[PDB]
Amino acid sequence: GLKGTGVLTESNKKFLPFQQFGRDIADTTDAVRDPQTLEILDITPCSFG
Amino acid sequence: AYYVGYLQPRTFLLKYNENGTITDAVDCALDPLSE
Structure with a gap:
């Protein structure tokens, strides 16, 4: 249900072990747990300028 | 010996470390230094 756009590095x-989301300075989700393999995946938005 | 406390709606500034562990906190309604 967490919608977003970015690269999943x-x-x-x-x-x-209970945590699912990662936040750094704001309401953005910086890191997210994989629902299937429990690997912790980064959310970096796609390159812009 | 066992200890019973009671919970109040209270604002805290939580010190997260680099490992994601809360290491310290400030009770924002304790004393005016904490405010």
Whole structure:
């Protein structure tokens, strides 16, 4: 249900075993857990300028 | 010995570390230094 647009790179984030989302400075989701493999995936929005 | 506290609606500033662990907190309605 979390909708977004970006590149799904490897996060290198140490989530606690209950945690599902990662936030850094705002309401953006910086890192997200894979629902199937439980791999922690980064959310970086696509390149812009 | 067992301890019973009670919960209040209260604002905190939580110190997350680099590992995602909450290491410290400020009770924002404790004393005016905390405000």
